Design a protein around this ligand. Sequence first.
Ligand SMILES: *[C@@H]1O[C@H](CO)[C@@H](O[C@H]2O[C@H](CO)[C@@H](O[C@H]3O[C@H](CO)[C@@H](O)[C@H](O)[C@@H]3O)[C@H](O)[C@H]2NC(C)=O)[C@H](O)[C@H]1NC(C)=O
Ligand SMILES: N[C@@H](CC(=O)N1CCCN(C(=O)c2ccc(C(=O)O)cc2)CC1)Cc1cc(F)c(F)cc1F
Ligand SMILES: N[C@@H](CC(=O)N1CCCN(C(=O)c2ccc(C(=O)O)cc2)CC1)Cc1cc(F)c(F)cc1F
Ligand SMILES: *[C@@H]1O[C@H](CO)[C@@H](O[C@@H]2O[C@H](CO)[C@@H](O)[C@H](O)[C@H]2NC(C)=O)[C@H](O)[C@H]1NC(C)=O
Ligand SMILES: *[C@@H]1O[C@H](CO)[C@@H](O[C@@H]2O[C@H](CO)[C@@H](O)[C@H](O)[C@H]2NC(C)=O)[C@H](O)[C@H]1NC(C)=O
Ligand SMILES: *[C@@H]1O[C@H](CO)[C@@H](O[C@@H]2O[C@H](CO)[C@@H](O)[C@H](O)[C@H]2NC(C)=O)[C@H](O)[C@H]1NC(C)=O
Ligand SMILES: *[C@@H]1O[C@H](CO)[C@@H](O[C@@H]2O[C@H](CO)[C@@H](O)[C@H](O)[C@H]2NC(C)=O)[C@H](O)[C@H]1NC(C)=O
Ligand SMILES: *[C@@H]1O[C@H](CO)[C@@H](O[C@@H]2O[C@H](CO)[C@@H](O)[C@H](O)[C@H]2NC(C)=O)[C@H](O)[C@H]1NC(C)=O
Ligand SMILES: *[C@@H]1O[C@H](CO)[C@@H](O)[C@H](O)[C@H]1NC(C)=O
Ligand SMILES: *[C@@H]1O[C@H](CO)[C@@H](O)[C@H](O)[C@H]1NC(C)=O
Ligand SMILES: *[C@@H]1O[C@H](CO)[C@@H](O)[C@H](O)[C@H]1NC(C)=O
Ligand SMILES: *[C@@H]1O[C@H](CO)[C@@H](O)[C@H](O)[C@H]1NC(C)=O
Ligand SMILES: *[C@@H]1O[C@H](CO)[C@@H](O)[C@H](O)[C@H]1NC(C)=O
Ligand SMILES: *[C@@H]1O[C@H](CO)[C@@H](O)[C@H](O)[C@H]1NC(C)=O
Ligand SMILES: *[C@@H]1O[C@H](CO)[C@@H](O)[C@H](O)[C@H]1NC(C)=O
Ligand SMILES: *[C@@H]1O[C@H](CO)[C@@H](O)[C@H](O)[C@H]1NC(C)=O
Ligand SMILES: *[C@@H]1O[C@H](CO)[C@@H](O)[C@H](O)[C@H]1NC(C)=O
Ligand SMILES: *[C@@H]1O[C@H](CO)[C@@H](O)[C@H](O)[C@H]1NC(C)=O
Lengths: 728, 726
Amino acid sequence: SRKTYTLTDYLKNTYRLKLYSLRWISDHEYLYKQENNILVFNAEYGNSSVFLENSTFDEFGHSINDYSISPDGQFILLEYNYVKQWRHSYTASYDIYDLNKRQLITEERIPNNTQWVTWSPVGHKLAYVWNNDIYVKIEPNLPSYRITWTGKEDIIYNGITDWVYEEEVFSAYSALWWSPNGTFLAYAQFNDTEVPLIEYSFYSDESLQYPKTVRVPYPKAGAVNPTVKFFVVNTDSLSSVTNATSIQITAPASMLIGDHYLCDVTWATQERISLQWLRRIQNYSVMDICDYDESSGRWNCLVARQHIEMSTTGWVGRFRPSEPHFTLDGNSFYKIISNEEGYRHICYFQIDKKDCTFITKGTWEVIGIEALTSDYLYYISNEYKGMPGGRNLYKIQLSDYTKVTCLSCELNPERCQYYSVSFSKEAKYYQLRCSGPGLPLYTLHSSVNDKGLRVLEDNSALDKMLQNVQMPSKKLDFIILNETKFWYQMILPPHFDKSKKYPLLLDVYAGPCSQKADTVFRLNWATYLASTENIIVASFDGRGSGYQGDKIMHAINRRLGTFEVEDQIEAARQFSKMGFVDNKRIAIWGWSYGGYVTSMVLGSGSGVFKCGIAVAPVSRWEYYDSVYTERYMGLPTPEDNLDHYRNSTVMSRAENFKQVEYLLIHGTADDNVHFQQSAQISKALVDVGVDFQAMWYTDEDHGIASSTAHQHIYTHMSHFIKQCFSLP
Amino acid sequence: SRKTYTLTDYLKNTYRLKLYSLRWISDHEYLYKQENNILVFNAEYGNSSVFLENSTFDEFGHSINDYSISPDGQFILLEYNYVKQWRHSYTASYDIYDLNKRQLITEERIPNNTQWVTWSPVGHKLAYVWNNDIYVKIEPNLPSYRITWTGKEDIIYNGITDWVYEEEVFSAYSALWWSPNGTFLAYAQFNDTEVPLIEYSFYSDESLQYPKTVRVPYPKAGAVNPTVKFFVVNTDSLSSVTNATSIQITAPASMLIGDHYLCDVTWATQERISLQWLRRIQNYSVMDICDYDESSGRWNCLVARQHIEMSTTGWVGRFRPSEPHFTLDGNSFYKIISNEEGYRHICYFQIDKKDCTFITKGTWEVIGIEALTSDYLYYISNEYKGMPGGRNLYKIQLSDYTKVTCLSCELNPERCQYYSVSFSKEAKYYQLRCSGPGLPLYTLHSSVNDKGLRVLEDNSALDKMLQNVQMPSKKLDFIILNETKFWYQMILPPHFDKSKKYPLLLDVYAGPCSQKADTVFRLNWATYLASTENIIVASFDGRGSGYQGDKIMHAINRRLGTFEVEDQIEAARQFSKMGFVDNKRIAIWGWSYGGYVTSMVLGSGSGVFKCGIAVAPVSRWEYYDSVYTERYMGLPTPEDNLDHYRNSTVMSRAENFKQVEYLLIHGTADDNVHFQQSAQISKALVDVGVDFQAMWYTDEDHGIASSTAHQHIYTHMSHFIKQCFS
Ligand SMILES: *[C@@H]1O[C@H](CO)[C@@H](O[C@H]2O[C@H](CO)[C@@H](O[C@H]3O[C@H](CO)[C@@H](O)[C@H](O)[C@@H]3O)[C@H](O)[C@H]2NC(C)=O)[C@H](O)[C@H]1NC(C)=O
Ligand SMILES: N[C@@H](CC(=O)N1CCCN(C(=O)c2ccc(C(=O)O)cc2)CC1)Cc1cc(F)c(F)cc1F
Ligand SMILES: N[C@@H](CC(=O)N1CCCN(C(=O)c2ccc(C(=O)O)cc2)CC1)Cc1cc(F)c(F)cc1F
Ligand SMILES: *[C@@H]1O[C@H](CO)[C@@H](O[C@@H]2O[C@H](CO)[C@@H](O)[C@H](O)[C@H]2NC(C)=O)[C@H](O)[C@H]1NC(C)=O
Ligand SMILES: *[C@@H]1O[C@H](CO)[C@@H](O[C@@H]2O[C@H](CO)[C@@H](O)[C@H](O)[C@H]2NC(C)=O)[C@H](O)[C@H]1NC(C)=O
Ligand SMILES: *[C@@H]1O[C@H](CO)[C@@H](O[C@@H]2O[C@H](CO)[C@@H](O)[C@H](O)[C@H]2NC(C)=O)[C@H](O)[C@H]1NC(C)=O
Ligand SMILES: *[C@@H]1O[C@H](CO)[C@@H](O[C@@H]2O[C@H](CO)[C@@H](O)[C@H](O)[C@H]2NC(C)=O)[C@H](O)[C@H]1NC(C)=O
Ligand SMILES: *[C@@H]1O[C@H](CO)[C@@H](O[C@@H]2O[C@H](CO)[C@@H](O)[C@H](O)[C@H]2NC(C)=O)[C@H](O)[C@H]1NC(C)=O
Ligand SMILES: *[C@@H]1O[C@H](CO)[C@@H](O)[C@H](O)[C@H]1NC(C)=O
Ligand SMILES: *[C@@H]1O[C@H](CO)[C@@H](O)[C@H](O)[C@H]1NC(C)=O
Ligand SMILES: *[C@@H]1O[C@H](CO)[C@@H](O)[C@H](O)[C@H]1NC(C)=O
Ligand SMILES: *[C@@H]1O[C@H](CO)[C@@H](O)[C@H](O)[C@H]1NC(C)=O
Ligand SMILES: *[C@@H]1O[C@H](CO)[C@@H](O)[C@H](O)[C@H]1NC(C)=O
Ligand SMILES: *[C@@H]1O[C@H](CO)[C@@H](O)[C@H](O)[C@H]1NC(C)=O
Ligand SMILES: *[C@@H]1O[C@H](CO)[C@@H](O)[C@H](O)[C@H]1NC(C)=O
Ligand SMILES: *[C@@H]1O[C@H](CO)[C@@H](O)[C@H](O)[C@H]1NC(C)=O
Ligand SMILES: *[C@@H]1O[C@H](CO)[C@@H](O)[C@H](O)[C@H]1NC(C)=O
Ligand SMILES: *[C@@H]1O[C@H](CO)[C@@H](O)[C@H](O)[C@H]1NC(C)=O
């Protein structure tokens, strides 16, 4: 009677979630990439028109992986020869297609191996980075104007982030910000001169006779960090002079006193930019508000205008200080910060007033500010039903904070408890995306009265297909520990019978501000383990987890590898005492940070776990990068936090691995959690004579995501788990 | 009833073979390092005396790992701070102890980080290499004299070998040869300026925050090779202000025409040195015989004096041209070369006569020339009983080749069929070392009438211990394939009963000139697998194997990865048809070349094998070094043998691994077979969706020999084999 969701179904994507990715081009229309052609849609009525034919670029000779239309609709940037670099960065070739002449531009082309390109927010100016230097094109076909000359590979970065800034602060390769109407181009510059290099072998295709050594400026905990400078250049002055002057905006004095980071840049108006800076000891940040001085040509940041944001119990922000959302005239802004109770809420600032006023409050948190009009501020929070793993869209009246309306809570409470949103240019319309607990649902709405214009995609096709397979169910609930409630989730085998005893697999991440217990609908490895192997796959959000206030989130401050580890063990103890858990068959696994916690758990000697798998785990904090590591652990020095850095390694627990079955997996070209980390774990296990299972993945990185490797690792891990569980 | 030989027994060395390592110091006495003190023994009678007390160096503050006594007995070189490099190279600190003053010398000490040191063959002169340059000390306490100034790390090597010459041609780090009485010091210079570098991470102790990248000049097949020059300096013409002049000896001409190697250097007299050169296409070599010209100060090598040694069916030599053994007057010499039938035998040469005369012949081979006197030539061969895996010592009368005497054959035919030998300085005495098939046995003899003076060590203590454990037995026999007989051996479980069906593990190496079927007694992993797990562990010597003639050895010429692989599959088929082998439980495993063969067999789709383990395998010949690879494969160019280089990779067979259980093991710091080789196998397997087991060993090299990793690898492999064999 009906098959189950099998490993091959997971690895071959037989059941696919349908999406609806649109791109707003104005306050009334959006583009909808339709594999073959790209159409333009009128939000009001739903009618469309082809914007670009699928055959428009047939005899290009190059497969196009993406495009970007200029804001004024006159040009289309064609991206090809895509070559991935880190999590966000990549290089590529670009051609520009004129839409009014319907001709590809052939003169003054963007160079090959370009690192980043972006249209101005209005019109059709272009700014790109090539060979670590910035270039600006006023017209697509005319010569570029070079803005920087200091660009040097692995050394000086203009307009793009170095490794640690890409991964840990901006979550982007780009380090340039056009002003609202395109007049000014602002950019950061990184000096990695004294940053040490992580080096590792890349084997490449079998044809390469000698392996290549990859080398990357990467600051490990406590090592020399990149330094940064910020500049603003007036692009409108490029005809008139040669070598346009880049005006530098420097430090707030309270930052210059030592190592610091640029963590946020947000343009407020055509002549006002705000910058947030953060000290290397990440519990103090400052926001500067800088105005262009028309008769000086400078950018001045009034000291009375600065805003300090700090924390006494931890670091600043969830992963960094939040971004401001300025009003029209840029004289005020809203920002999510931790209130006096440790809960992140929106507060209202006046640019020259030291104190801000909170406009939301309660024992829940605002996830993010989504849109701001003269009338309302739109935001997502987990307020509904008191569930930290749910997400809904709310709107608060700016003239009366008493008028808070939830726009998504009630649309379909049964199927939808987790939403994200995309507003049109002036917030006239918005697309709501529901991701769980039922199948994804995309709808379009008009902001006037919040009416739901129509259903964009409801995955009805996947729904028909799934009723023919025994799919698992998912319970989201909580347990109480020392008067505090902690949430957990369980992917339950089909026809779950609490009368029976099921083997259990603890799927963990548990890094700071993480959340593994939510209402999102997923089709992943756990779906298969529960559906086909009848294994319960649980996750627990303990101390250190996010979106529930700083009391819980900062509990691991300066103490990584302690409570978040203990709380996972306790959770497994609690689960086992629920009655439907086979005590003798409890396992644990995790990937990055989750691999670390898994290994720490397995070496705890708790006796609770029979076996476990760690994929690309951190093994000692001194091996990971400075920005992420120090944010939670401070510095690795006698003076500050070296004792705990040395007390929380996986290596020191090697001996206890004699009690469990361990599978250690790592990609050899992991630029993020270096193969080094697992190479040291394996060496310590060998040194104490502990037998374990291993698998390296040649040339895979932190995601072990190439098509073949992804299939191979989940296959190898499925065999290990069924063996450990005495089942097929 | 009695325990078996277990895994722990093997890993903890509970049963230890006893040895008798002596060091001849003259034609009448030898030193015997006793793990406390070192004594000196009189060969004739067997009486001894302490030569150095065990407490002579207590408050040194340094553990001494070795020492060397000057040929004149006046000094003792003390080696400490030993830091291993490759298979033979290493660096160390040295101090010289004066024996007549019983004082450690404190001035003009040998530098720290010294790379090589060697007393002159007579007296007490010293030649050492520090920072890649040669230095000479006429007296232990006086300043040294710099001989070379060109030494540069990874770059110019004077008196020491670079990576590939250390591993593949000289099997040593030393590249200097003192003349007989210490007058001249000959040396080579290895120029690696265009040799590419192999680079790999080294993680070190957990304290190291960032991994270090090790880089070694290493020519992979077909890459730019190091170049070499040969010099001779007169150590007697010393100077406080003078660079001694190094006289260079250049190439034959037939060598200078292309890439070549210096493969052998043997001093013939006080003023005659012979040198053998090999072309990069290793099927042609030339011996030069050079004499010092007293009135020129030069070394001339008369063209009419050179000897050419070549092969039409393969390369020259077993792994390289054999070395010559010169007569007293250096006007004639004996050398093992392949005769017209393909069998290696001793040939007698006159330095200015082109043709040589064979003094031994037959379908067996001379393994090596061990000693030469005016009277006789002593050698080891596998002639006895026609068994190629047996070794015995013979002597042939130089005046009458009809007088050939076997000196070891009959001593104890039951216990001893494999010997090595160590003669005193003038060959007045010799120590025979029997290594199987029974327990090792060391005896001492006098060359006069070949009397066996006495038993030095007979392992009677291990014998008593072993009778209390169920030890496996060993069968050495053969099978015939196409009219040719090929040898094999089986380590048989205790109480072997050919009525039962046993799982079988094929233990393979099979590289060119290899021999895995012999009469040597061993206590290893196979002993445990047979004794405790009841697994038959077999080995087979097929095409390409050595010591049986060029017809069999050269069969794989330019064809590595073909017949030696097929022959292992065929042997496994034959074994299964013997009746006592369980067909459903046949596995195979090997290390290095054996790992390559194991992987090729497992990827053949023959269906014969259920599972296998490859340790540090070669996976594609373009990844291994030039000297070894090109010896059997020629060059990887379309004009030469590129097609076969590309057809013999393990990766091309990825798909067929779907049928077997495979365990792939490699050390991450392997400087010999780079981790790269296994990294490419694992990647080809992943690309075709084949599951397999793997294990990398952090910071281990080709030997995966550190105490903890050795134990770990064998424990992991044992679990894998038992799982595969229920
Ligand atoms: C080890 O081997 C290296 C490579 O063969 C040697 O090197 C190099 O040195 C020679 C010096 O003559 C250079 O010769 C060229 O330059 C001169 C003048 O410009 C010309 O007259 C001549 O015709 C050549 O064009 C080589 O360019 C140079 N090759 C390199 C750098 O690889 C090296 O000297 C040798 N080491 C020792 C100690 O001998
Ligand atoms: N380097 C780390 C980066 C990181 O934690 N984040 C950035 C990328 C992915 N994440 C996000 O983008 C994201 C998460 C949360 C928020 C928010 O609530 O404000 C916003 C963005 C989660 C944080 C992840 C990481 C941690 C490890 F401990 C590790 F060993 C490897 C890693 F890749
Ligand atoms: N590099 C190779 C060196 C090698 O084959 N020899 C040198 C060291 C050990 N051997 C010997 O010393 C030796 C072997 C034979 C003889 C003789 O009969 O003349 C003399 C010495 C065997 C040859 C071994 C090797 C081969 C591989 F294919 C590989 F993947 C790794 C290796 F280390
Ligand atoms: C969607 O439909 C509207 C309504 O018909 C289109 O707007 C009309 O465009 C035509 C031009 O062909 C004019 O004659 C009308 O006066 C327009 N009426 C308006 C402004 O409502 C609109 O172009 C369509 N949009 C898309 C993207 O197809
Ligand atoms: C103005 O443009 C110039 C010329 O294109 C830039 O000057 C060069 O900059 C590099 C440093 O990256 C120097 O090595 C050259 O010597 C400079 N030559 C000059 C002065 O033309 C210059 O960087 C730009 N202006 C400023 C202040 O950066
Ligand atoms: C884009 O913004 C810039 C900067 O505010 C505008 O340029 C200024 O225009 C005002 C006129 O209203 C002048 O007083 C200033 O001298 C200009 N500043 C300069 C020269 O940078 C520009 O008008 C805006 N673009 C558009 C089309 O609105
Ligand atoms: C920001 O973090 C640093 C480090 O935790 C705090 O300064 C340290 O405070 C502790 C007290 O718990 C002392 O032991 C150290 O000597 C201090 N080190 C210094 C002054 O560098 C600092 O106070 C924190 N700031 C806030 C707002 O709490
Ligand atoms: C030494 O080996 C080389 C390479 O095999 C021999 O030269 C090649 O001989 C083959 C014939 O089988 C030809 O196809 C090639 O064109 C030859 N290449 C050359 C001339 O370099 C060479 O003859 C061998 N020497 C001996 C003694 O047999
Ligand atoms: C291109 O567009 C046409 C017109 O609607 C459509 O029928 C066709 O399927 C598209 N081709 C591709 C490659 O999807
Ligand atoms: C980029 O490289 C291509 C070769 O693929 C070459 O034809 C072209 O001229 C280069 N320049 C640009 C901007 O495409
Ligand atoms: C980068 O910093 C280095 C090292 O501290 C200094 O030499 C250099 O001037 C800086 N580079 C630039 C262009 O600012
Ligand atoms: C509750 O407090 C006890 C007592 O210190 C401790 O053992 C336990 O780990 C705590 N649990 C939580 C959720 O903090
Ligand atoms: C050598 O020194 C060791 C060290 O304890 C001692 O046991 C042994 O008896 C000594 N042997 C002689 C012959 O002095
Ligand atoms: C060894 O013993 C013999 C026989 O008595 C004796 O003549 C000889 O001198 C001894 N060795 C030495 C060098 O004293
Ligand atoms: C190295 O050896 C030299 C030469 O004898 C000596 O003076 C020096 O102290 C040694 N170095 C160390 C660090 O022991
Ligand atoms: C000996 O010759 C070398 C090679 O030119 C030279 O560098 C060195 O200085 C000479 N010896 C001395 C001490 O001058
Ligand atoms: C060593 O040989 C040289 C050169 O043949 C000779 O001049 C010298 O006398 C010999 N040394 C001795 C001690 O016989
Ligand atoms: C024996 O003959 C067959 C057929 O010619 C061949 O395939 C096999 O490889 C041969 N074996 C040997 C040792 O030559």
